[PDB]
Design a protein around this ligand. Sequence first.
Ligand SMILES: [Mg+2]
Ligand SMILES: [Mg+2]
Ligand SMILES: [Mg+2]
Lengths: 312, 88, 49, 95, 100, 141, 52, 48
Amino acid sequence: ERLEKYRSFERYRRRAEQEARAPHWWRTYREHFRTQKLLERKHFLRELRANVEEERAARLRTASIPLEAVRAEWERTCGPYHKQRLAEYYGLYRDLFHGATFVPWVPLHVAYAVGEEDLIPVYHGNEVTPTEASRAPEVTYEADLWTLLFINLDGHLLEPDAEYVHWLLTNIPSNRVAEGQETCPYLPPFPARGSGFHRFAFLLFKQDKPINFSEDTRPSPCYQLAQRTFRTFDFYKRHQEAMTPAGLAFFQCRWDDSVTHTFHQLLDMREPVFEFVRPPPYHPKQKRFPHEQPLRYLDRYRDSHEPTYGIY
Amino acid sequence: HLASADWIEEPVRQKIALTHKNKINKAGELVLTSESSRYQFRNLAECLQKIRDMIAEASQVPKEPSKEDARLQRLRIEKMNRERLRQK
Amino acid sequence: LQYLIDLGRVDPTQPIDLTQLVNGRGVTIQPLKRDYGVQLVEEGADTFQ
Amino acid sequence: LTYCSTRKGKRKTVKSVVHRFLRLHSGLWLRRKAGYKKKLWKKSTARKKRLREFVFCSKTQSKLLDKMTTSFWKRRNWYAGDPYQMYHDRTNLRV
Amino acid sequence: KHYGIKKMEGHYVHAGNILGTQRQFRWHPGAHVGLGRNKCLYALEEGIVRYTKDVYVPNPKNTEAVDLVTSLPKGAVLYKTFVHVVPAKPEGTFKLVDML
Amino acid sequence: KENEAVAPEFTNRNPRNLELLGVARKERGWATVWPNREFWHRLRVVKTQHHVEAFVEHLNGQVVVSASTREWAIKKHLYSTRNVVACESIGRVLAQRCLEAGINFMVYQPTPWEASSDSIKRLQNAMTESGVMLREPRRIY
Amino acid sequence: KTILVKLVSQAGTGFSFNHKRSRLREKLSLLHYDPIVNKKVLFVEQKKIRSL
Amino acid sequence: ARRQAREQRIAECMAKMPQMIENWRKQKRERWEKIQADKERRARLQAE
RNA sequence: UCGGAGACUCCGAAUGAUUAUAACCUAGACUUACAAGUCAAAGUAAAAAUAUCUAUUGACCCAGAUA
Ligand SMILES: [Mg+2]
Ligand SMILES: [Mg+2]
Ligand SMILES: [Mg+2]
């Protein structure tokens, strides 16, 4: 009576949505399933209010905004926070670090070179064909050592947990990466046909001091998958004292024509083809008398569709 | 072996290879198999017939592709989305 | 058919007919029950040489 | 049922069964759904779909019909092109 | 007739199993549980039935449901009982058909 | 060959692998309850008293990608937090975040009055021109 | 009372389906699916099957 | 011959089918439009 | 005889109106002596997914109709 009644469905929807998140004792579906900078913002906002043109655009609803400036600014402030969710959604933290999660701090920019006119940016989680990945991607980031490597989380075939690395760069001084020793040489992505989309991630680790990486070094070129594979969590554990992750960029890859060339020419193995197999259908145990069941009942339990004549 | 398949017309061999390159073995010999019967004769018939279809489809030009299905439509959207994404 | 030929109960060198199938007890035929002959079947083609 | 007929001294088939049911050599019996031709204008489409089907018989009903039919109706019939060729046998049944 | 809960909690439920039949909407459909015209509830995927109570938000189009929801006071929030079937099988697995 | 050796059964660990393929499950129930749960991703846009925000969330409800006018970078470049163009701007901004993220298909189910809203129509137009599709494909069996 | 009538496909096929209409209404015409033609076509009343 | 007669018969009617469908649709519209012509508009005019 | 309500007392029916007309095929189940009666994914096909409430029965034989 005294309490107000919803006059709009939306306010009730907000109340309903809020309650769903809130815990309840009864079983529910969810269970089962600085200051100076702020002052600068106020000054900028006051300028926007004063601007007559901005008011004219708003009333005429013709205003436009440069997304590029916002995109660059977005990365600086809460990019880390949004980037963390992107990686968190894709489960990169849990698989790579065995459940450990690191917030990204240093933006990681990598773009795959296509010819010379332009180079495709490696947007987080974006799909990139292996064909374009033929050339080693250009890596751009700001640094004052560092180590950056490409990891195939689910690429590995023989062992589920194991992963394959395209290449590993160690002892990177400042921005320049040529000086840092290339422990592993680049190899084109080789996702198998029928294995589905493969998530490939790039991890950048700050290096406090130079460390011996004799184990990391691989013969150039190395064509042994067993030699190539290692555990990222184990590798981080060895150098965890002086190595801490700061940059994460990942992309999505699927089978393409270029993959066929890689498997035989240099990988020197026959390409693996995979088929999606759904669980076989369920039927009740066949009865000697299928009472009330149509004549098709027998065809359900016959494996062979061709006539058999037995002794005759 | 496609290279030693002199019986097949040489120009068409080029077209068949690329169109169905996936079925082509690493050595370059087309590999095709069928498993749908208990009689090798009927299974073999499938293997031979697919060769004839491949030769016929390659020799003939299907001028009209007409429309595509849902699967191809999704792929086309994916490719278009990627092209705009690579602004840099 | 192959099993019968193997054991010497059908003479492959001679022509085969319904009489020589019945004589070698290869098949059993009942004319009174609407039998109109013998139909060859595809089962066993691979082993047939 | 005529258990012993005067002229021959044999059991007699009931022809009401021969005109309604089909026996597969395994021992199953087929039948139609009563009323599948009756008052179709007031039956729902799903209802009509069920009626058109051929249905099996129970152990009791199958046992009854086997008492009302003679062995001649329980033999193997080698019909060329038979549309019931594949259904005369049971496969992959453990019981 | 004989309306009741056919499948109790903890019971394995196959694709087409009918969870329950109700003369009226005593139990509302849940995730992966289709609703029949006769209002009977049938499962859609293999799973384990679990009953929960969740906030009921009606579709905007129907007038009667919207009017009743508005009539409720601001503080009060209504609830309904739902039948859910948690999927218990993986939709598919990956196998190597052939090595080419 | 050691390289040739491969386990008969592959185990792709990517949560999004099956969904991109198209075989991932969808909630096919909730017949009596609206909004429908038949969506891999749902794009919910909330209009507050002073701010309008758009969020893309998975079945679990976690917001994979979020665009909000309250964020400093956008509002510094945006004259009035609540406006029809502001809804247009956030739509384009969210689309770019969605496109770079790799999520190109979502399901958005506005209410009848929400659908009638010009701002939502304008924001939806931004998604279409940006390449974001508001209708997802049906699951394949 | 209502009369049962036979609506006949006008596409030249023999397909027909019986429907019900009120005796006081005009002859009913209803687009319907013709299985033979695998297309929708008009169905027109031909005969009065009975009165119900 | 019967099959050919059957086939040609269906084709001829099918060629004429689109016009008949439009005519049937037109009649339904003509009935529907007239129903609301005086259902409320006549009442509104009377109220005026 | 069927079904609705009450806990035997009351109400109805052998359904009518509205229906831009509602396919085929096929996993799994409900109900049930038998017979009858219910719900339905997938696949496929028309079209641009469920007819609308309230509720509604009659077997076999045998006669009618049609292309
Ligand atoms: Mg014999
Ligand atoms: Mg029964
Ligand atoms: Mg279906």
